[PDB]
């Protein structure tokens, strides 16, 4: 259902459901959002901003789909920056930002995902795994842990999100993948993004 919680706008990354990510939190309003969440159920809205240059983005300059996450672990560094390890849990639609000026706050809806199980979803998963195996030869910065674990992901939507996190693509492409709720469409996009030389197939 619908809930209000504090927001942490991300400058220049997208956190998918099931990803565990260290982050540094240094803007005044972001820090305050975090202190808030840590006195409570430790849960925050991660949502990406449209332009990484903007230091103080407004609601219209932040995307409208984000990720509900839990703060796993926290360390205030001597200079005041807060080092935090966060875990994405689920896609979240942003209904609107509240009136709060101490920090960003928002009401968020749950999302439903078209999932399952024609010959399509099936062939796409296997194809995306196979393609991923090739892709990481061309992108040597994918950690070896992910090369071992990603071929084992059984749930298509999770598979697509894990590969998405590891692609060397612009922010806008990552945010687009977060917004594709149809799993078959998402796997199709991750496949296309992994194409090294634009398929003759889309001219």
């Amino acid at each position: 259902e619908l809930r209000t919680l504090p927001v942490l706008p991300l400058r220049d990354i997208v956190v998918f459901p099931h990803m565990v990510v260290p982050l540094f939190v240094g803007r005044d309003k972001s820090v305050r959002a975090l202190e808030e969440v840590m006195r409570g159920d430790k849960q925050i809205l991660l949502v990406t901003q449209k332009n990484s240059a903007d230091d103080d983005p407004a609601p219209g300059d932040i995307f409208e789909v984000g990720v509900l996450a839990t703060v796993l672990q926290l360390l205030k560094l001597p200079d005041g920056t807060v080092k935090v390890l966060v875990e994405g849990k689920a896609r979240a639609a942003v209904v609107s930002f509240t009136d709060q000026e101490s920090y960003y706050e928002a009401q968020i809806g749950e999302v439903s995902e078209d999932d399952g199980a024609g010959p399509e979803a099936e062939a796409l998963s296997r194809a995306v795994v196979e393609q991923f195996e090739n892709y990481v030869k061309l992108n040597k910065k994918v950690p070896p842990e992910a090369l071992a674990s990603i071929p084992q992901i059984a749930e298509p939507g999770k598979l697509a999100d894990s590969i998405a996190a590891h692609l060397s693509v612009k922010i806008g492409d990552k945010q687009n993948l977060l917004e594709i709720f149809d799993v078959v469409k998402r796997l199709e996009k991750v496949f296309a993004l992994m194409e090294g030389e634009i398929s003759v197939l889309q001219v």
Partner: protein
């Protein structure tokens, strides 16, 4: 959860992960007890620091883009403070 120990969590990011953050006029004054520019007290300038993953400041650059470029030019992997 709490997946790491405090040292492991403080270390986390070594050796290459650095973050880049604004320097406020307050830090500028601490670093320079014999005097700063009036420009350092203005919103018209925002200096950036590049910091190791455990908080230790590595460098001071004129702006965010220079901080990001300086870090990449020295084989570090810069990230934002959000």
């Amino acid at each position: 959860s709490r997946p790491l120990t405090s040292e492991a969590f403080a270390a986390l990011g070594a050796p290459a992960l650095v973050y880049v953050r604004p320097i406020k006029a307050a830090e500028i004054l601490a670093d320079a007890p014999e005097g700063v520019e009036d420009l350092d007290l203005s919103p018209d300038q925002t200096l950036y620091a590049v910091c190791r993953a455990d908080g230790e400041r590595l460098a001071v650059l004129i702006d965010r883009d220079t901080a990001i470029a300086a870090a990449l030019a020295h084989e570090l992997a810069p990230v934002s403070v959000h």
